[PDB]
Design a binder for this molecule. Structure first.
Ligand code: CL
Ligand code: CL
Ligand code: CL
Ligand code: CL
Ligand code: CL
Ligand code: CL
Ligand code: CL
Ligand code: CL
Ligand code: ZN
Ligand code: ZN
Ligand code: ZN
Ligand code: ZN
Ligand code: ZN
Ligand code: ZN
Ligand code: ZN
Ligand code: ZN
Ligand code: ZN
Ligand code: ZN
Ligand code: ZN
Lengths: 21, 30, 29, 21, 30, 21, 29, 21, 29, 21, 30, 21
């Protein structure tokens, strides 16, 4: 999920975009 | 773009910016 | 009239607080 | 939608909760 | 509602949302 | 005060409401 | 005219910074 | 009140300080 | 029309995220 | 300027990047 | 004014408030 | 720079003002 990927680890812009609709 | 840990409201704000008119979903328990 | 872009920015912060662990979908259109 | 309902008028906490998962 | 530690500006924003037209007081040295 | 209750400890919604006017 | 709800959200953040340890009361009405 | 004075016009830091405790 | 003061507050947060380590100058006038 | 371009209309991430160093 | 550590977006917001119409520069790698 | 002065150390209001244009 997003917390594991972007909060306790770091999300690239491309990875943040995976959570867009 | 920043390369840093984004949590809580700061993560939601980042999604708002990145996703634009498409919107997004914030599911923290996933 | 309300600035939708600024309003939405505000709304998602409010949803973060209100929804908590349940999360939410933000679908403006 | 949330923009139609909560940008035009102020939504209370209870009205905002509708949009949660 | 979230169940988390709220400090500083994030605490003030939470009070703004929760309190509505009633307003609130933020007294950190109390 | 609010810092002890909600910042170094956790406030329920009802506890945050104690700081409303 | 200014959106009072968005304005107030902004104002309390500014007061947090300006007032510091003194704190403040936010009384919109 | 603060809304009447600082929403209509931009309040400087000095004007905002009036509202502090 | 858009509230420039609220808009700018929002813009600098967006620039923080977009610019990252590069930083930015915010020159409204 | 950024206010003229990004307050009137919504600037995309790509348009915002112009203002970075 | 607060006497505290200001980082990231919170630092940028503080500069926006403090600097007014003058604007500011946020250079984190300096 | 600003990070060393105000983020990993504390900036007085006067020190934050050094970063204004
Ligand atoms: Cl944005
Ligand atoms: Cl706004
Ligand atoms: Cl709201
Ligand atoms: Cl934070
Ligand atoms: Cl709110
Ligand atoms: Cl202000
Ligand atoms: Cl933007
Ligand atoms: Cl400000
Ligand atoms: Zn890390
Ligand atoms: Zn980190
Ligand atoms: Zn934006
Ligand atoms: Zn705003
Ligand atoms: Zn915590
Ligand atoms: Zn924060
Ligand atoms: Zn609100
Ligand atoms: Zn805890
Ligand atoms: Zn600190
Ligand atoms: Zn302001
Ligand atoms: Zn310290």
């Amino acid at each position: 999920g997003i917390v594991e990927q972007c909060c306790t680890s770091i999300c690239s812009l491309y990875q943040l975009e995976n959570y867009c609709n | 773009f920043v390369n840093q840990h984004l949590c809580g409201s700061h993560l939601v704000e980042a999604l708002y910016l990145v996703c634009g008119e498409r919107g997004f979903f914030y599911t923290p328990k996933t």
